[PDB]
Amino acid sequence: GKLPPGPSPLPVLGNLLQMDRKGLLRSFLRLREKYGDVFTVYLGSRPVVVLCGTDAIREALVDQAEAFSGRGKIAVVDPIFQGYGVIFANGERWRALRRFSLATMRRSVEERIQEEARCLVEELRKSKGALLDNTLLFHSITSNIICSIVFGKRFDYKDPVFLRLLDLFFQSFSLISSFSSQVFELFSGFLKYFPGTHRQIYRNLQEINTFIGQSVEKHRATLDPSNPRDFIDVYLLRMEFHHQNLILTVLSLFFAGTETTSTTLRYGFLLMLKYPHVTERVQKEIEQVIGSHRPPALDDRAKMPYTDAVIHEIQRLGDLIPFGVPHTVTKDTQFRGYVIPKNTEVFPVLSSALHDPRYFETPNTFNPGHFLDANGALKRNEGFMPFSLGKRICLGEGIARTELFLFFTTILQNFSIASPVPPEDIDLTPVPPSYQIRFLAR
Amino acid sequence: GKLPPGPSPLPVLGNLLQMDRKGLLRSFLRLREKYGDVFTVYLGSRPVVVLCGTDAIREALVDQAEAFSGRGKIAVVDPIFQGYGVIFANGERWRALRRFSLATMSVEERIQEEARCLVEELRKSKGALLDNTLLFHSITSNIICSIVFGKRFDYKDPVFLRLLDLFFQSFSLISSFSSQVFELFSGFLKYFPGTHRQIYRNLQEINTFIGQSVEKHRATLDPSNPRDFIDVYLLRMEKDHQNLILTVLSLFFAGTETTSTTLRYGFLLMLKYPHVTERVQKEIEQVIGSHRPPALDDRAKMPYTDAVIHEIQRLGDLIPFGVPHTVTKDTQFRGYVIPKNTEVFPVLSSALHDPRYFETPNTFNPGHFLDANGALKRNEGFMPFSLGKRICLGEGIARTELFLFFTTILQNFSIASPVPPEDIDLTPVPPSYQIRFLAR
Amino acid sequence: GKLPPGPSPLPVLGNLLQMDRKGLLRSFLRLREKYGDVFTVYLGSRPVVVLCGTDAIREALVDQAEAFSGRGKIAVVDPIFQGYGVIFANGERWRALRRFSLATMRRSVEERIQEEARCLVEELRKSKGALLDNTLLFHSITSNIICSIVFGKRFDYKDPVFLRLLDLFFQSFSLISSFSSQVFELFSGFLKYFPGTHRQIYRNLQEINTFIGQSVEKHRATLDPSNPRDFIDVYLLRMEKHQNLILTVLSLFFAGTETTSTTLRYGFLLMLKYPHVTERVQKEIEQVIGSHRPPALDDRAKMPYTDAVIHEIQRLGDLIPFGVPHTVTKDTQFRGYVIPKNTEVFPVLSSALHDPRYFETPNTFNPGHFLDANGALKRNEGFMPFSLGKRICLGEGIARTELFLFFTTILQNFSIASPVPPEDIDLTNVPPSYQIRFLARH
Amino acid sequence: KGKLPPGPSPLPVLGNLLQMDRKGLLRSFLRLREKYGDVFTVYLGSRPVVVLCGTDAIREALVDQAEAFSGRGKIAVVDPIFQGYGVIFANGERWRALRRFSLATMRDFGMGKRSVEERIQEEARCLVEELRKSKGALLDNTLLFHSITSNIICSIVFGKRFDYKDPVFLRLLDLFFQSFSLISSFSSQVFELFSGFLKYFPGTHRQIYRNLQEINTFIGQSVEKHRATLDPSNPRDFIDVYLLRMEKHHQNLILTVLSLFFAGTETTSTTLRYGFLLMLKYPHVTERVQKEIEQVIGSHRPPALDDRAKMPYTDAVIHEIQRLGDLIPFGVPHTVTKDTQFRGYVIPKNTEVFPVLSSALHDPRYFETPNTFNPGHFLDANGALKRNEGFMPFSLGKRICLGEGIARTELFLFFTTILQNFSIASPVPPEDIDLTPREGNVPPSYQIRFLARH
Ligand code: HEM
Ligand code: HEM
Ligand code: HEM
Ligand code: HEM
Ligand SMILES: c1ccc(-c2ccc(Cn3ccnc3)cc2)cc1
Numbered sequence A: 001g002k003l004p005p006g007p008s009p010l011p012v013l014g015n016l017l018q019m020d021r022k023g024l025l026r027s028f029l030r031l032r033e034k035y036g037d038v039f040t041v042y043l044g045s046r047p048v049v050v051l052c053g054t055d056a057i058r059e060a061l062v063d064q065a066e067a068f069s070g071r072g073k074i075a076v077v078d079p080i081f082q083g084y085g086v087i088f089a090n091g092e093r094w095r096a097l098r099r100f101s102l103a104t105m106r107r108s109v110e111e112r113i114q115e116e117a118r119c120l121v122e123e124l125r126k127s128k129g130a131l132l133d134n135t136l137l138f139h140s141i142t143s144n145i146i147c148s149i150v151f152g153k154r155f156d157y158k159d160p161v162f163l164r165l166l167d168l169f170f171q172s173f174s175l176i177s178s179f180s181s182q183v184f185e186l187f188s189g190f191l192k193y194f195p196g197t198h199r200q201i202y203r204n205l206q207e208i209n210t211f212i213g214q215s216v217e218k219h220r221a222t223l224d225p226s227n228p229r230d231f232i233d234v235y236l237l238r239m240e241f242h243h244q245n246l247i248l249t250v251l252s253l254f255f256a257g258t259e260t261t262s263t264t265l266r267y268g269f270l271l272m273l274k275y276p277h278v279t280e281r282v283q284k285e286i287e288q289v290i291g292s293h294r295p296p297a298l299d300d301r302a303k304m305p306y307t308d309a310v311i312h313e314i315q316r317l318g319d320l321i322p323f324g325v326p327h328t329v330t331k332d333t334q335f336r337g338y339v340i341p342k343n344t345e346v347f348p349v350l351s352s353a354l355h356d357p358r359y360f361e362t363p364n365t366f367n368p369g370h371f372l373d374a375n376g377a378l379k380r381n382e383g384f385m386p387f388s389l390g391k392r393i394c395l396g397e398g399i400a401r402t403e404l405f406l407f408f409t410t411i412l413q414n415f416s417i418a419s420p421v422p423p424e425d426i427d428l429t430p431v432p433p434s435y436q437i438r439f440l441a442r
Numbered sequence B: 001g002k003l004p005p006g007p008s009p010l011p012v013l014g015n016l017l018q019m020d021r022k023g024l025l026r027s028f029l030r031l032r033e034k035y036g037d038v039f040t041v042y043l044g045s046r047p048v049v050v051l052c053g054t055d056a057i058r059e060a061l062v063d064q065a066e067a068f069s070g071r072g073k074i075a076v077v078d079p080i081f082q083g084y085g086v087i088f089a090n091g092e093r094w095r096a097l098r099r100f101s102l103a104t105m106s107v108e109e110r111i112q113e114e115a116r117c118l119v120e121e122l123r124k125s126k127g128a129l130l131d132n133t134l135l136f137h138s139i140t141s142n143i144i145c146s147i148v149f150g151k152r153f154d155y156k157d158p159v160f161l162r163l164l165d166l167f168f169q170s171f172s173l174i175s176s177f178s179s180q181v182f183e184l185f186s187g188f189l190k191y192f193p194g195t196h197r198q199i200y201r202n203l204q205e206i207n208t209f210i211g212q213s214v215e216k217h218r219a220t221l222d223p224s225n226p227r228d229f230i231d232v233y234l235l236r237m238e239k240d241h242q243n244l245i246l247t248v249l250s251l252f253f254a255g256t257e258t259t260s261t262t263l264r265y266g267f268l269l270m271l272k273y274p275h276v277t278e279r280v281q282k283e284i285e286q287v288i289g290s291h292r293p294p295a296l297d298d299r300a301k302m303p304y305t306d307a308v309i310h311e312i313q314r315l316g317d318l319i320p321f322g323v324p325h326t327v328t329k330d331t332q333f334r335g336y337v338i339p340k341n342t343e344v345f346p347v348l349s350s351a352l353h354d355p356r357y358f359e360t361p362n363t364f365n366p367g368h369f370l371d372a373n374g375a376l377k378r379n380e381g382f383m384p385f386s387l388g389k390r391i392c393l394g395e396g397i398a399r400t401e402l403f404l405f406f407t408t409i410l411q412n413f414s415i416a417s418p419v420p421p422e423d424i425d426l427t428p429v430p431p432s433y434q435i436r437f438l439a440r
Numbered sequence C: 001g002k003l004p005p006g007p008s009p010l011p012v013l014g015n016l017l018q019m020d021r022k023g024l025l026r027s028f029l030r031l032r033e034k035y036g037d038v039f040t041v042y043l044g045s046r047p048v049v050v051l052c053g054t055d056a057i058r059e060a061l062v063d064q065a066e067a068f069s070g071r072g073k074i075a076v077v078d079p080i081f082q083g084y085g086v087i088f089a090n091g092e093r094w095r096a097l098r099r100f101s102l103a104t105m106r107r108s109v110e111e112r113i114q115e116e117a118r119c120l121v122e123e124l125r126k127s128k129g130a131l132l133d134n135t136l137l138f139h140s141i142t143s144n145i146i147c148s149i150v151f152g153k154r155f156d157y158k159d160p161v162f163l164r165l166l167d168l169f170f171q172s173f174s175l176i177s178s179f180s181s182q183v184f185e186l187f188s189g190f191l192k193y194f195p196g197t198h199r200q201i202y203r204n205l206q207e208i209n210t211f212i213g214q215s216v217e218k219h220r221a222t223l224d225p226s227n228p229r230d231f232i233d234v235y236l237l238r239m240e241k242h243q244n245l246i247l248t249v250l251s252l253f254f255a256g257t258e259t260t261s262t263t264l265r266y267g268f269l270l271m272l273k274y275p276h277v278t279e280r281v282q283k284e285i286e287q288v289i290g291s292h293r294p295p296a297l298d299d300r301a302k303m304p305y306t307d308a309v310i311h312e313i314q315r316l317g318d319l320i321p322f323g324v325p326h327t328v329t330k331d332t333q334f335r336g337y338v339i340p341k342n343t344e345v346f347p348v349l350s351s352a353l354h355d356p357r358y359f360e361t362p363n364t365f366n367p368g369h370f371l372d373a374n375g376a377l378k379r380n381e382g383f384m385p386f387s388l389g390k391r392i393c394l395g396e397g398i399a400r401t402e403l404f405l406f407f408t409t410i411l412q413n414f415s416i417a418s419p420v421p422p423e424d425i426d427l428t429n430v431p432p433s434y435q436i437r438f439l440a441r442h
Numbered sequence D: 001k002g003k004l005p006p007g008p009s010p011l012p013v014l015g016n017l018l019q020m021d022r023k024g025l026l027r028s029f030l031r032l033r034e035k036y037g038d039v040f041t042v043y044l045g046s047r048p049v050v051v052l053c054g055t056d057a058i059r060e061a062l063v064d065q066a067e068a069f070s071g072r073g074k075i076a077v078v079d080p081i082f083q084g085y086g087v088i089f090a091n092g093e094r095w096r097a098l099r100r101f102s103l104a105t106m107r108d109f110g111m112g113k114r115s116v117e118e119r120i121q122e123e124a125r126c127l128v129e130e131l132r133k134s135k136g137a138l139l140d141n142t143l144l145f146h147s148i149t150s151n152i153i154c155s156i157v158f159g160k161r162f163d164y165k166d167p168v169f170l171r172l173l174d175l176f177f178q179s180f181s182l183i184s185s186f187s188s189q190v191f192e193l194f195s196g197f198l199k200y201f202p203g204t205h206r207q208i209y210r211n212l213q214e215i216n217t218f219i220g221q222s223v224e225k226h227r228a229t230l231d232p233s234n235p236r237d238f239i240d241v242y243l244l245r246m247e248k249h250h251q252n253l254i255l256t257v258l259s260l261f262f263a264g265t266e267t268t269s270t271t272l273r274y275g276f277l278l279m280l281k282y283p284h285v286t287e288r289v290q291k292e293i294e295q296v297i298g299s300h301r302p303p304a305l306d307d308r309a310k311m312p313y314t315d316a317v318i319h320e321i322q323r324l325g326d327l328i329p330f331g332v333p334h335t336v337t338k339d340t341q342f343r344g345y346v347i348p349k350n351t352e353v354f355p356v357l358s359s360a361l362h363d364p365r366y367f368e369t370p371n372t373f374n375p376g377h378f379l380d381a382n383g384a385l386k387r388n389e390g391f392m393p394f395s396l397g398k399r400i401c402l403g404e405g406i407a408r409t410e411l412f413l414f415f416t417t418i419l420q421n422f423s424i425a426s427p428v429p430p431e432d433i434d435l436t437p438r439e440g441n442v443p444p445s446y447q448i449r450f451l452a453r454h
């Protein structure tokens, strides 16, 4: 019974000097070759266990789910200061949210998404096939879904309030560091920056908490059970400053997710620009199953292997969350013939699975074959886990994947796509590059 | 026996919603007004104790030094994984470095010689408008080089530049408000220091190099004449590799960088207030005259200039929050309780601007550090280097760099800029700017 | 969310000054009246949560079994010193023993108890109805069972080796303390005496181990699989797939048998006080088993009264009034209080066995407790002399079978008498030493 | 490099409990020392404990690193989650207070040291009067010694000694030394080890004690009486000292102190019992002592504390008695406070530690004949008292006996005064006195006769 093997560390720095010039990911890969699927690396004085390949990540997150579900120290409340019960309250809250998101699936996403998909088309027609940067377009459409689900009705793309919160929630801003400043941090035991809060993207923060209040007010007055129209009055029901903020927090979480959805699309479309023959096939399957006279609907995905396989492939290659979200072991645990002590930090390196050779004939090339059998139907591939697995698997998986199928097909149904750059010359290597694309009505 | 009071937190966010639009500092200040000199705020789910004003910070860092000296979780080794002894080795190593830095206090001469080189470079400027940023990084850095490798680099030496590049290479990481709220909810930050890549070529070239210098040193080294910090390394080694040095080197640079900025800020300040620069140039002529380089012993006979430099460090306030510490033992502080392992901010800024110690906390004012007769006077609020068990290891070097570099410059040149003094905006890190050095 | 209420403590002593003159149990009871079913008391500087009444104990040990299953600090290994894996090894070992004991129940255990039951009768016949102290007799019979189960064959009552180990395992010996010596201990944080501390603890044992070695040898020297004949070669098999483990296991088995023996001793005295009950039982015996065959386990089903009586005996006897203290594993929410991980907890078994909400007359001998109107056995939730939950007695099966068979077989072949008239028997947790006479019914 | 103290490998549940000498835990520690050295790690149950052997090792720990090795056992550590801090701290200050008060008894101006000396002197006197009234009868000094040492504590706490047969005295002599035993089988113990919980626990016994409720009452009476009559700045005894800290929980706090004090007195009493038996076996030593007594104190005044200075032999002898007696062989276990570096090993905060006092009192590097009675241990060539570092029957460091002062003064005075006025004899001939204890480190029971020297 030993700890997962790893490279020996240096004081202050840990293994920070043995990383590939190529990046932390390459490092983890070369490390795997030497030490295997489970190993121990050091960021500063702290050890972390790295999990590589499908099988290893699955065993951990799935087979021993309770053991591997813990959050990072920043998220753990100190009873000595807050006492328990806030611990537990949070507990019940989580379960509640977790429960509500299943209900959403069981005018649900399918219809709301079908609506938004329409609006998108109309906007794309009004583009009159102009070259543009889809970034704002995709953020808007994925976001609206969240809005319809939370406040009850989509915003108009140019609605002040919408923009103000599209602004708040995706406002970029960067913090700056020198190599020296960092080594020092490592030596302090404290990072320079911490979250909180927007500076000029905080301008609207004041307005958005405020907007929430208003919507809750309106909602409250017309509220009726057992007729909960959207998430707000669901809140109001569990209920029946702090409340407005509690909402925010959910809202924020939801947006953190939508942003990934949006990027998954952006990446997907660029990818399709590089590979028009695929886009063609998909347009074909579309015409063969949905035809030309009705909107695509969620039930169609079943009868459209290629397109699904293609979307799967997009999530796979895209790999937007390569490291997964780090967890924290809950109980001293026996894993793959090693030991992992309660409170060890752990990386399920999702990327190492999405590119796992034992599961993907060509881990680095775009290849729908990954998800198709001889007969050409969708086939399960265990390496496909872009949403993670286990107790903490994405709360948004359902909504997101439905967003991806519908937004994707509806678009390819009504338009074809082109760019200045010739397919041969599209560089897929990165977040996906900003680019220009043109939507042409069919 | 209670915990330090504070604003009630929200789930996930903590007190992150009750901060002033104006910034974390303003918040801490308004908070002080309401809860007092010691209070408790929440970043995420985690509590942190904030320390405000001279008296409070001093009590903590100085009076209860052992209690308030702990480092952040990132810096704490886990025995279950590494075992103890590496804990202890580090321990002894620290004491060693701590001991060596007192021995260093040489420095005086090396600085003086660098001071000279600076002057010659400033002459060659032929009074051209420039951005002193690179100049100051170079001069302060060389000191560290002379102290570690044994001899200054030439300002344009490839190796120098390559490491001036490694150690100050800026690079930024980017975050959305949403990405952040999510981090808070994960318990994990997106970015960890140094994980980033990486100037890999440069770090690698140096690592290779230190090797070289150690080699050379090894072959020619001897006692009781250990020339520079490398041998001292070689000696502690021979008494019982390239990587430890690097780490020290980095630490040293992290510091030098602050020294450089303290100068940059100082000079801009003097551009806004030429009548002060005049006085200083006067005291310089009255005490050091015009025919010898300023020397450390001069500071004693030059109150004004000292007071001014003090005032510069005060206003500059480059480390407003101090470096967060970690309580070591359950402790009784100012009639509250602080549990072992509580994170703590000694908000240095709150002292450097403490009204109980500075007649005009927010205006440049050398009177802060002068009595009626006009001699240097101790001001307890002056704590830019922190205080206590972990007070700056570089305090000595740094302050010596500041006095010499400052005076020598003002001795041989006067300064001017496009922007008229009335129009210099001191509000921020100090703005990038242009300045001209004119020989006297 | 608060901690369980309780009396305020004093420095060093805790609540040790507020105990009834009557004993710790009375205290817990008076405490219950004031603070309720869950409260917090202090032994020295250390808090402990006390659990009172059936419902409370059950909720804890049963409903939240994983939460309330932790052992005392003495039993918790320090990884810094021993590393994990020994932690885990122990873990798997436990499960193993736990598994083997269910198998024992699945040549068999019942027969082994029946054969011993016979031997008991023959010894009781050879008593020629002499007044004696059944203490040694009962320790012997219950012990043999363990020996048949472990080494494969009963010892003869006067076999040297038997006696030598009957001696080791039940050898009494006492340690002595002054009130002052104790207050001081409380102030040191350390007790004067430690289990296993004694010189004799060691001496008895070395001799014990040697016999084991031999039996393992023999057993080792002759087994075939799955021709395994008892616990030894079961050991040998898990090994092939030492004496030290066997010994520990055996000691725990004896720790238990000792309770079984006392349960009998108490039972018989009780019956001396209440001959009209003994009569009934002798009657049911004749009505169901008759006079010409030994009682058998299957008979208990068709003998409500007798079962009810044995239940009543365990209930009143209350040999483990405080239960075996446990240690909360996870921060927990219990009965609208909070209990922090690592809190020590008493499930005061006695408070259930005497719970008014479940026993018409908690303090008088009353088989009615376990019978319905029609006179069949009825479940009573308060009956938990073996504890409940993840750590419920490993020996429950064997013990209860020992109790039914030993009891009935005896009362079938003999009747009982004493000098003292039932009116005078003293109930006065150990049962008084006494004299009893077994008279054949021929 | 940096490693934990070495030791024998443990077994599940049992730890090292199977590798102990048949001879007893002490012999074990000794044989273990031979193999692993002065600092090693043994396992009681699943718990590790660090064992400290020999003078040098114990001294380095308790003395050189005193703050590091001063921690109490888990039973004595308050949980903040339940009690909050401050009770932690209050206790702290309380301790210091008691610690301060005990020095005030010993030094050395005002009430100070002499008042205490006088009390022992008086209670010593009665011992003589009582011994005269024995008319040289064979008796068991156990109760006599418990009484005399106890009274000191009473004079110090309540302000005046108790008549030896005074009901209240007896009642509390009874409470505080009342023996009572709990019983265990080998199996019941193995099980405990497996539970993580011991069967018994201090005070958890109902019997302790009927008198407990009544004494407690006594204190109230005494505190009451004291309260009305007391006055600073002359504070007569510990009660009004309490009253003063109060005026600046009532009996409970006193009771606890009282108990602690008695726990100690009991050791003092045994030290005497042992001492006297020892002298019965070695009458030629008793003669010498009686001689020094006559040569320094003469025959016409009571011995006084200042005499010890001028009486090397007798002192050396008493030292030797404490040494051989070894009433607290294991010392009182402590608890490491801070992760520590000790003798080139590592000891983690919260490790339990035994400073095996016996291993020092019998340390060959300090005692020519560790196992024989030998005053030479504490004398130089010239025959004066010489310091012996191995002599630490009171422990050392931050937590060294609070009673060292009183106790040692009790031992010198009680001892000499007695040997001054009587000589001693027993049925058993010296050759035949067996000094080895009985199942316990406690001295074997015995009969002795005090004969006046008139
Ligand atoms: C479209 C592509 C998306 C991907 C690949 C993605 C991926 C993930 C991943 C990797 C996690 C980590 C689970 C873990 O911590 O183990 C996650 C969790 C989560 N996802 Fe998403 N996300 C996406 C979009 C969304 C969306 C649209 C939502 C909208 C609700 C969302 C909500 C969440 C939330 C709230 C969690 C938290 C996990 C937890 O319960 O602790 N994500 N998602
Ligand atoms: C220019 C003015 C400088 C200022 C105002 C400054 C300020 C500080 C402050 C406030 C700390 C707080 C330490 C703590 O309590 O955590 C610190 C630490 C430190 N400083 Fe500087 N510094 C300066 C220049 C330098 C230089 C040139 C060096 C060269 C080596 C240096 C080396 C260090 C080191 C090694 C520490 C480590 C603290 C520890 O041991 O925990 N500093 N400094
Ligand atoms: C009337 C007879 C017995 C009674 C009343 C009894 C009662 C108990 C009780 C109350 C416990 C504590 C469960 C807990 O930890 O909460 C226990 C545990 C145990 N008993 Fe018995 N016992 C009896 C006989 C036996 C016998 C014959 C064995 C033989 C194996 C035995 C073996 C054990 C063992 C090995 C445990 C360990 C508890 C655990 O694994 O958590 N007991 N028993
Ligand atoms: C006659 C021989 C005595 C011996 C050998 C003795 C020995 C000890 C020892 C070994 C300790 C443990 C200290 C430690 O943890 O290192 C101790 C503690 C103590 N003893 Fe004594 N004692 C004696 C008599 C007394 C007497 C008469 C008193 C009367 C007050 C006394 C009061 C105490 C007290 C109050 C402590 C508290 C220890 C602590 O503060 O942690 N002892 N004693
Ligand atoms: C550390 C912490 C968080 C993350 C992170 C990963 C994915 C996302 C986007 N997202 C949100 C919900 N599902 C996916 C945000 C943050 C990565 C490293």
Ligand SMILES: c1ccc(-c2ccc(Cn3ccnc3)cc2)cc1
Pocket (backbone or CB within 6 Å): A181, A184, A185, A188, A190, A191, A192, A193, B251, B254, B255, B256, B258, B319, B321, B322, B323, B324, B392, B394
């Ligand atoms: C959090 C992390 C690092 C720090 C820190 C502050 C100042 C400095 C500059 N410095 C380093 C040594 N002397 C000055 C580096 C890092 C503060 C908060």
Ligand SMILES: c1ccc(-c2ccc(Cn3ccnc3)cc2)cc1
Pocket (backbone or CB within 6 Å): C252, C255, C256, C257, C259, C320, C322, C323, C324, C325, C393, C395, D188, D191, D192, D195, D197, D198, D199
């Ligand atoms: C604390 C420690 C041990 C015990 C204990 C409980 C039961 C027994 C007898 N026993 C053990 C297993 N089955 C019955 C011995 C000790 C109780 C409280």
Ligand SMILES: c1ccc(-c2ccc(Cn3ccnc3)cc2)cc1
Pocket (backbone or CB within 6 Å): C181, C184, C185, C188, C190, C191, C192, D260, D262, D263, D264, D265, D267, D328, D330, D331, D332, D333, D401, D403
């Ligand atoms: C473990 C726990 C307590 C003890 C103990 C030692 C000495 C005493 C008596 N005593 C009182 C003052 N000095 C010693 C009581 C208990 C020893 C080992």
